């Protein structure tokens, strides 16, 4: 009757680059987790600390929907306990995560013949991200002794790189759209009930 705005999250025309992942708050609304399936060629729906089947019975204080795009071979990194270029330097889930991870193949939208280069990921970072950290800096990465002084060169690398999405690349290199739902419990009124 007062549906949560899951519609503008899962069915958004544009998704964010993973390094600049999007976060939407969700509160004061009736959440129906059954609309979520969208007929996508490689749909994936995993939950942690909670049962996917009984989600419609539960209440939470607040819900967070984070969204972004990655490679198919990278979808496995969006899980508690994982490491890899995405989990370490772009989007990190906590080990004690309570929530759900929904991913699907978006080759139809996010690829094109001649290539879509608009989606970026961080390739270089000196240390791992904390859970739910977002790093959007574009400082030249210093891989050696000499200072970079803002100019790319040897041992001086622009830290972000663009994905190349074309429809005929293999599935591991095809684009996937991801939504992460985190469920918060406080000693506060619940405002997201199914």
């Amino acid at each position, epitope marked *: 009757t007062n549906l949560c705005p899951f519609d503008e999250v899962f069915n958004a025309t544009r998704f964010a680059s993973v390094y600049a992942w999007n976060r939407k708050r969700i509160s004061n609304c009736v959440a129906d987790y059954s609309v979520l399936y969208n007929l996508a060629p490689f749909f994936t729906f995993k939950c942690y600390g909670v049962s996917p089947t009984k989600l419609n019975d539960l209440c939470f204080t607040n819900v967070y929907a984070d969204s972004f795009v990655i490679r198919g071979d990278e979808v496995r990194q969006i899980a508690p306990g994982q490491t890899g270029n995405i989990a370490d330097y772009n989007y990190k889930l906590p080990d004690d995560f309570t929530g759900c991870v929904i991913a699907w193949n978006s080759n139809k939208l996010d690829s094109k013949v001649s290539g879509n280069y608009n989606y970026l990921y961080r390739l*270089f970072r000196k240390s791992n991200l904390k859970p739910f950290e977002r790093d959007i800096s574009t400082e030249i990465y210093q891989a050696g002794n000499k200072p970079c002084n803002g100019v790319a060169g040897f041992n001086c690398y*622009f830290p972000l790189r663009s994905y190349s999405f074309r429809p005929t*690349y293999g599935v591991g290199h095809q684009p996937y759209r991801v939504v992460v739902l985190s469920f918060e419990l406080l000693h506060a009124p619940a405002t997201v009930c199914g």
Partner: antibody
Amino acid sequence: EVQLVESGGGLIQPGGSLRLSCAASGITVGWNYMSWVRQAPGKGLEWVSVIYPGGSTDYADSVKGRFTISRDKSKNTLYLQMNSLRAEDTAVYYCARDLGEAGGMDVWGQGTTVTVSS
Amino acid sequence: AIQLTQSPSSLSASVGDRVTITCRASQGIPSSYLAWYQQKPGKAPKLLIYAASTLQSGVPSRFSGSGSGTDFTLTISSLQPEDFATYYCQQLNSYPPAFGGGTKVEIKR
């Protein structure tokens, strides 16, 4: 000026252990993806292991549970600890700096030879 | 995973020849995920080309690369005596990376 100098190879019985060292100059080991790659006599190249700038590690399947990559930032040195060695591990071992899509494996060590035989 | 197949296994050429070496991927990858290396007997591999067409610093301009999807190429426009060697292609941005089986460039007579 930029180089990787390896040491620690040699002759060993199956089941034994060896440690390989890769001292660096001109790159900062702790700030790079550093890989180990091996080449068996008469064969091609086989990736062995990697350590990320932030510390995560990865291994070829044939080596998991036996080999361990690590680094000493103070000595600017990369290491590979090799336990439970097998005859198939016989190879020239190279360390290299990996830049991925941003550059290849652009800097390589001279190689150190590992022979595993009874 | 990806498998890279190199072609031909060996090729015979003379100094001054235009020589082209092919690397074929099993599935289809960004052009920016391929690299080319040269190796001579008893020597470490040396990087030639990364991201399929970028000439590594210090490598003579007679070396060039091209390709995207599944079919990649390394070309030497005018072969010199020091070019006689073995050539490998490699997949980037992946652990474990695939390596091609190699192409040995050899002297014609």
